[PDB]
Amino acid sequence: KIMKSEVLRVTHELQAMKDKIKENSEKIKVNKTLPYLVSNVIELLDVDPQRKGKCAVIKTSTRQTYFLPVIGLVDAEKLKPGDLVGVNKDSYLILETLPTEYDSRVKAMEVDERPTEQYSDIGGLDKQIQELVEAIVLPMNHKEKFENLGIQPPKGVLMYGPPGTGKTLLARACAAQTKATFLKLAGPQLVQMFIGDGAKLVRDAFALAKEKAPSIIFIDELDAIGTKRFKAGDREVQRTMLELLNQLDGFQPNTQVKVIAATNRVDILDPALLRSGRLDRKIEFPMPNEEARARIMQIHSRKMNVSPDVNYEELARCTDDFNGAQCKAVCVEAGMIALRRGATELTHEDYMEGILEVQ
Amino acid sequence: AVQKVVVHPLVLLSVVDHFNRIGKVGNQKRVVGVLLGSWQKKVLDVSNSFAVPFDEDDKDDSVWFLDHDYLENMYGMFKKVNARERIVGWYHTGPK
Amino acid sequence: DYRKKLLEHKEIDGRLKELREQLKELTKQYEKSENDLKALQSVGQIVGEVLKQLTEEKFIVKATNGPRYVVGCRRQLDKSKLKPGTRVALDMTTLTIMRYLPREVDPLVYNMSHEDPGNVSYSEIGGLSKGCLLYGPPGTGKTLLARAVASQLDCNFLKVVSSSIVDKYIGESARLIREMFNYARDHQPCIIFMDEIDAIGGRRFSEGTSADREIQRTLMELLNQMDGFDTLHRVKMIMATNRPDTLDPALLRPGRLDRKIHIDLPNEQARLDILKIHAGPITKHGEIDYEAIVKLSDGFNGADLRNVCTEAGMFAIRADHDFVVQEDFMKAVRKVADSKKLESK
DSSP states (O other): OOGGGGHHHHHHHHHHHHHHHHHHTTHHHHHSSOOOSOEEEEEOOOOOOOOOOOOEEEEETTSOEEEEOSOSSOOSSOSSSOOOBOOOSSSOOOOOBOOOOXOHHHHTSOOBSOOSOOGGGOOSOHHHHHHHHHHHHHHHHOTTHHHHHTOOOOSEEEEEOOTTSOHHHHHHHHHHHHOSEEEEEEGGGSOOSSTTHHHHHHHHHHHHHHHSSSEEEEEEOOTTTOOOOOOOHHHHHHHHHHHHHHHTTSOTTTTSSOEEEEESOOSSOOTTOOSSSSEEEEOOOOOOOHHHHHHHHHHHTSSSOBOSOOOSHHHHHHOOSOOHHHHHHHHHHHHHHHHHTSOSSBOSHHHHHHHHHHO | OOOOEEEOHHHHHHHHHHTTTTOSOSOOOOOEEEEEEBOSSSSEEEOOEEEOOOOOOSSOTTOOOOOSHHHHHHHHHHHHHOTTOEEEEEEEOOOO | OHHHHHHHHHHHHHHHHTSSHHHHTHHHHHHHHHHHHHHTTOOOEEEEEEOOOOSSSSEEEEOTTSOEEEEOOOSSSOSSTTSTTSOEEEESSTTOOOOBOOOOOTTHHHHTTOOOOOSGGGGOSOSOOOEEEEOOSSOOOHHHHHHHHHHHOOSSOOEEETTSOOOSSSSOTHHHHHHHHHHHHHSSSOEEEEEOTTTTOOOOOSOOOHHHHHHHHHHHHHHHHHTTSOOOSSOEEEEEOSOTTSSOTTTOOTTTEEEEEOOSOOSHHHHHHHHHHHTSSOOOOSOOOOHHHHHHOOSOOHHHHHHHHHHHHHHHHTTTOSSOOTHHHHHHHHHHHHHHHHTOO
16 A cells, blocks of 8 residues: 555645635635626637637627627536626626526516416316326426436427317416416517517517526417418518427427417417427317316305305306306306395306306 | 747846845845746746745855745735736846 | 455555545646636727728727727737738727737627537438428428438538518518528538428419519519529529428429428338337337337328327326336327327318
8 A cells, every 4th residue: 555655645735725725716706796887798709820719799888899708717508699797897807697688578578476276276177188287297397207218398289279268277277286487478469569579579488488497488369370371460470480480490409498378269270380399289178068167167166155056957058158267257257246145155046147247 | 949038127126126135244145036927928028026035055055045935925925916927937146 | 364455455545546536527627717717817908990001010990989099010910910901909008909800790690600419310310211392291300301411511500491581671582582592602502491481382373462472573583593594503402391282383393393302101111210219218118019100100290200109108107107018109109190190181
């Protein structure tokens, strides 16, 4: 072991390095304390002919352009043309780069942490919603098994069906089970007065989904803008829409946060919406029958003082060709006039009274 | 390797300081100073320097006294205030 | 007694030599920290532009902020890059010149940077041995192949999206056809991809409106630049689409689309090969039988065959079993594939 006795000197040199890094590593806090302004960064690779070529183009907020090479600490997500970077007083170095995404009108579209309703509020849809509950639970907790089996979850799910079916509140009810950040988005929000806004809205959605933590982005009324016209505004929605499809077709690192979509009608079905990353999950959600409407109305009305003498035959007969949110409006209306009816217990005539009241 | 060097008068005026801070003791030997410069480029450029207490023996010439802690502390603080210049060599004021 | 002390001391020396790798690896990064701290000392540089040069040594610079200045020449650089018309960089002190600044489009970096890695994709396309038509029979993979060779080399990333010919304003897209195709004629190597051409492939059977007439007019420029007075011997275009029925029979002339590649899974060796490349990272039981999956599958989509096989792997993960037998593959690829035949209208 006489040859291995020189390792002690090496360990003393290494622990001496750990003892001497406290000062030069300690000045990091006083030199990198606070970047006082914000400057935009534009990446431009240079060539010196070590003597290697590496530079970048800087733009300050006060419209002043300067010169500086790519410097700072170890960069992994950096080197992108972004803003909100660290800079000292006048030397103009890059110390702390953080993405900005400002235009809060699109950033703070729907800031929802988590909803209140859950998946246990409906009745008679487990045979078709269980695939979605799996498709949102197993891709969140079973990422470890995705390498043993080589499975990549789909990013486009088509939640299509007739309107008024409560698909929005049901997908949100599953978003409560996702436990991630819920972010709504409306179809008619892409159509703006100025040009090129849809690119900023789409790249903003993938800026918060790509940049931010694992979240949930549910959109609705996509059929209202998914028109395949052959000037025209829906062709501009073909520029923004086909741009989004290009970001769901040309991006292999799109294994991040999913994009859930729902269409209230399948009359104008875009044929280009068929792909593993695109809207491949096509589970048909028809109009619930009087049995299913009595189920979702019973579980949605399990909190009010409902009379126990309900055979569901009269309401099952009156509810003809109705939808989910319509029976939800009947439940809410019954909870509205049942107060002024004097009797605190919900009666049986209030069902047809609400049906003929709002419809 | 190196064709020419560049020496600023600041180090020689620091030798004027070597002759100033003597204190009239009667030794005036070859005080050795730690020469600093830029060895990165092919040409050598001396910016500034400092000194280290250096004393020899009267009879025996092989006696020489240097310091490692003072060199690492003065070089450490000087590198902390200015990291663009590092150690290159030394120099003595003796004519022989 | 003596023979065991050599192995024991070899074990003490082993656990003594196995602790250096936990430090000597991160000490390189710790020293790299001070290397960067010494690399951030080159600060205080500004930019400028050169318009008129009077003296060969000292010329006039034009700063971005608006005020103009004059600078000198540094002893290190030479007169090669000092010629006018090249954007350079300046210093706040003495207005010296460290190096130049090559111009680029703010957008030219985006148009010349998007790149896709992966070199095995060229050999992962399955058993598949001046224009190419990628039409849409019951089989997909039009993007995995174009992005497979495009991911291999492609010599560029000149992707042409069918949504870039919108032209919300007056339909003068001829400036973009001649501009981009003029870039194709300028750069000696060029590969053009035309994905989802069915949207801009209107058959103009009836009287088209102003929105259709401008797109068909861009098709008239395509005629004038394919069979007009301009050859395309060196450039190549890849017309990808979805339905091989409305593909502009005026454009279906064999003068442009030499060959037709029906992207399908006809051959049993192609379906078996694509099944094996998609069945790579999946683990299964010892009972393996691919001839039933390949035999029962008739005229399906490749990537959607991956979605049906992985859909059977999730049908098998519903019962949270680590091993996946091929029974759920035959019955789940069977039933789910029959649902794809139901939704194949």
